[PDB]
C-alpha cells in the first residue's frame, strides 16, 4: 500500500491573522454601524486553541482608533505669568483660585500651577507668581465624555474565536471555543490603578499575568463582585466665560458658595474586606510560604500615584493610600475598623490641564461643569505590580502601579483572537492519478 500525496480543498485549518476591525454601537458616532440584531454564536466542540492575551494584536487595534476618534473631537496655549493667593475659606487646605494679567490687549485649582518669583525688589512683600503646568509642552488644545459600549466586529473573511472556559488565566489552551462575528459590550473608560465598569467573572477572583514570577509584568486582577464607589464634588462652580481671541472661548470657573468641602469618595469597607480576603487566598497559591504585603504606590508625576476618574466631565485624582494598606500574613485576616465600618474615604484632587493619552504627549483643557458633580461606578478590576527586591524574607510587596494604558483593555480582550481560514490542506492516502 504505497502512499500518495493528495490536495484537498475545504480543510478547517485556522491561521491567526491581523486586520482592521470595525466598531459597532447603539448610538463616537462616525464609522460605527448599529449593533447586530442577531448575534449568532456557534460552539465548535472538541477544539483546543492556544490563546495569548499578552501577544494579542487586537489591543493595539483598540489603543489605536481611540486616540484617533479622540483627536477628531479636538479640532490656544497662552502661557502667561499668573498671580494668586490662598482662597478665603474632609476640609480644603490650600486651593489657589485667582485671575491673571493681560490676555490680548490692555480657577486653576492646585495641580496646574508652578511657583516662581521675579528679580524685582518686591521680595520684602511676598508676592508669589505662578505658571501653567504645561507651559513648555508641544500643543495645548481646548474642547461631554460618556463611555458608549463599543462592539468590535470581524470583517469579511475573518472570524473571532471566543473561549468560554470559566477558568481563564491569560495564556495556555481552552476547551470550550465558540465563534462570534462581534463581541460583548466594551466600555472605553480610561482609569488607572482600578478598572471601573468592567466585566465581572463567573467563578472566584482570578489573577492573570504574562509571568507571575516576574516583577516588571502587570498583574491584572479581575473580581467577581461589583464593588461600588461614590465620588462627588460637593462644591458649586460658576462659569466665568472668559473670551480671549477673535471668537474664542475659555472657562476658568469658580465661586465662593462655601468652598470648604473637599471632593472625596466612599467605598464599602465591609465589601472591601471580602474582596481582598479572596485575592490574598489566590495570591498565596502561586506564592507559597510568603506574606502578601500591600503597599503605597511609587512617585514622580502626580497623575501616576493617584487614581484617574471621569465623573460627568471632570477628572478626579484620588490618593489611594487608605486602600489596601496592610500586611496580610494568612488568608482573610488583619482587619482594622475596631467596630467602626465608617465608609473608608479617599481624599481627591482635581485637575484642569490634562496630560492626555499616556505615551505621546499632547495636553488638553477640560471645561468645568456648572454646579455639583456626583458619580458612581463599579470597581471590577485591579492593576498591580510586584517589587523585585533582594530583601525578600517571605514578604513580596505589591503596589497599585497603573502600568501601560493598554493594560486597561487587555482585561476585556483576553477571551478572543482573530483568525483567518486557510481552506486547502494536503494529506496522504492510497489513491493514484491515472496517467
Amino acid at each position, epitope marked *: 500500500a504505497k502512499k500518495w500525496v493528495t490536495v484537498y480543498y475545504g480543510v478547517p485549518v485556522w491561521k491567526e491573522a491581523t486586520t482592521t476591525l470595525f466598531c459597532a454601537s447603539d448610538a463616537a458616532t462616525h464609522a460605527c454601524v448599529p449593533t447586530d440584531p442577531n448575534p449568532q454564536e456557534i460552539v465548535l466542540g472538541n477544539v483546543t486553541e492556544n490563546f495569548n492575551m499578552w501577544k494579542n494584536n487586537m489591543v493595539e487595534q483598540m489603543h489605536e482608533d481611540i486616540i484617533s476618534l479622540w483627536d477628531q473631537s479636538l479640532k490656544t496655549p497662552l502661557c502667561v505669568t499668573l498671580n494668586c493667593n490662598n482662597v478665603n475659606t474632609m476640609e480644603t487646605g490650600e486651593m489657589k483660585n485667582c485671575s491673571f494679567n493681560v490676555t490680548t490687549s490692555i480657577l486653576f485649582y492646585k495641580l496646574d500651577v*508652578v511657583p516662581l518669583e521675579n528679580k524685582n525688589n518686591i521680595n520684602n512683600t511676598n508676592i508669589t507668581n505662578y505658571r501653567l503646568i504645561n507651559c513648555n*509642552t508641544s500643543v495645548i488644545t481646548q474642547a461631554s465624555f460618556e463611555p458608549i459600549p463599543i462592539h468590535y466586529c470581524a470583517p469579511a473573511g475573518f472570524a473571532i474565536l471566543k473561549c468560554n472556559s470559566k477558568t481563564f488565566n491569560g495564556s495556555g489552551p481552552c476547551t470550550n471555543v465558540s465563534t462570534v462575528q462581534c463581541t460583548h459590550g466594551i466600555r472605553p473608560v480610561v482609569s488607572t490603578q482600578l478598572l471601573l465598569n468592567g466585566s465581572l467573572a463567573e467563578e472566584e477572583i482570578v489573577i492573570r499575568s504574562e509571568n507571575i514570577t516576574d516583577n*516588571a509584568k502587570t498583574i491584572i486582577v479581575q473580581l467577581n463582585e461589583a464593588v461600588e464607589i461614590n465620588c462627588t464634588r460637593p462644591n458649586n462652580n460658576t462659569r466665568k466665560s472668559i473670551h480671549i481671541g477673535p471668537g474664542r472661548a475659555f472657562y476658568a470657573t469658580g465661586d465662593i458658595i462655601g468652598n470648604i468641602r473637599q471632593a472625596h469618595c466612599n467605598i464599602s469597607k465591609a465589601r472591601w474586606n471580602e474582596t481582598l480576603g479572596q485575592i490574598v487566598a489566590k495570591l498565596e497559591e502561586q506564592f507559597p510560604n510568603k506574606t502578601i504585603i500591600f503597599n503605597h504606590s*511609587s*512617585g*514622580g*508625576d502626580p497623575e501616576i500615584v493617584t487614581h484617574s476618574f471621569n465623573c460627568g466631565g471632570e477628572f478626579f485624582y484620588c490618593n489611594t493610600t487608605p486602600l489596601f494598606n496592610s500586611t496580610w500574613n494568612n488568608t482573610r485576616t488583619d482587619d482594622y475598623p475596631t467596630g467602626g465600618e465608617q465608609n473608608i474615604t479617599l481624599q481627591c484632587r482635581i485637575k484642569q490641564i490634562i*496630560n492626555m493619552w499616556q505615551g505621546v504627549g499632547k495636553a488638553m483643557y477640560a471645561p468645568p461643569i456648572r454646579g455639583q458633580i456626583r458619580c458612581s461606578s463599579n470597581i471590577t478590576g485591579l492593576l498591580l505590580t510586584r517589587d523585585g527586591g533582594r530583601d525578600q524574607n517571605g514578604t513580596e510587596t505589591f503596589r497599585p*502601579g497603573g502600568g*501601560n494604558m493598554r493594560d486597561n483593555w487587555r482585561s476585556e480582550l483576553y477571551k478572543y483572537k482573530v483568525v483567518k481560514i486557510e481552506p486547502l490542506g494536503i494529506a496522504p492516502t492510497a489513491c493514484k492519478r491515472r496517467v
Partner: nanobody
Amino acid sequence: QVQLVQSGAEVKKPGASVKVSCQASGYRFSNFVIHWVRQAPGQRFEWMGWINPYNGNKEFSAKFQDRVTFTADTSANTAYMELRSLRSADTAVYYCARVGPYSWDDSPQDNYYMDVWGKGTTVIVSS
C-alpha cells in the same frame, strides 16, 4: 537597590550623533522622570532637559533647543539622548539622574531634585 548604569565612552568626530543611554534597574522605569546634565572639566554643572517616560512629556532647556533630542524605551527600561550637531566645546562628561518621589503636601514641581545619579560617561570630540 536603585542604580542607574550608563553606557561606555563614545569618542566621535565633530558633526556626528552621540547616543548616550541610561538603564533603570531597581525600580519601575515607567514612573519616574529622568534628567540629563552636563559637566565640563573645571566648569559647573548644566541642565540639558528631562523626559517623562510615562506620558511622553518632553522639556529641554533653551540653550539646547535644536541640538539635543530625547527618546525613551519603556519596555526596555532605558532612556536615550541623541545629539544633532557637535562641536569641540562639547567635550564634557554626561550624566543621568532620577527625580524624587511625590508627597501629598507639596507643589507638582517640588520633587524634581535628581535623587539617584548614574556612573557618568565621557565623550571626546578630537583626541
